[PDB]
Homo-oligomer: A and B are copies of this chain.
């Protein structure tokens, strides 16, 4: 057990213990969770999460690019139209699928921001630790939200790291700066 406590308290979250000594995590699982939350070393997020938007008409292999962006061991495909992040437990790359505007504006800002955040799950809370949010969508970011119900739409475009677009060509071409508002 002190081995499990070593691998937990020294560094990481419960996932590393689950990968190191499972037989000591099937037992004492609630107490490792409370030790982690009380020790204070529960991993915050102190980095910048890249945000790659993808735009294209339905059928252009949008989601294929997302599923091929990283290994399926480290992709959390967020369920749609919910505020719940259930099952996450840290999964580096987060692909918000086909996102037409079904997330609160300030919450979308805070996912794409660069400072700690704890997202919510059904009956608990899980610390957000993503590193590349792939926002697969259908329209340009200028049609997700309306300027009426938003403080300032620039506050989101400031965070879109890259932006792949689909034009009348079988390839998907990145966007060099902004023809529209700059990112």
Interface residues of A (CB under 8 A from B): 1-2, 4-6, 9, 14-15, 18-19, 22-23, 25-32, 34-35, 37-42, 44, 46, 57-59, 63-64, 66-67, 72-75, 77, 79-82, 84, 86-87, 89-91, 97-98, 100, 102, 104, 106-107, 109-110, 113-120, 122-125, 127, 138-139, 151-152, 154-155, 158
Copies in the complex: 6
- Since A41-B73, A87-B125, A102-B106 are in contact, a sample of 10 more A-B pairs with Cβ atoms closer than 8 Å, ordered by chain A residue number, is A9-B22, A22-B39, A26-B32, A40-B89, A44-B72, A46-B72, A63-B113, A77-B115, A77-B151, A138-B151
Q: Nearest chain B CB to A71's CB is how many angstroms away?
A: 10
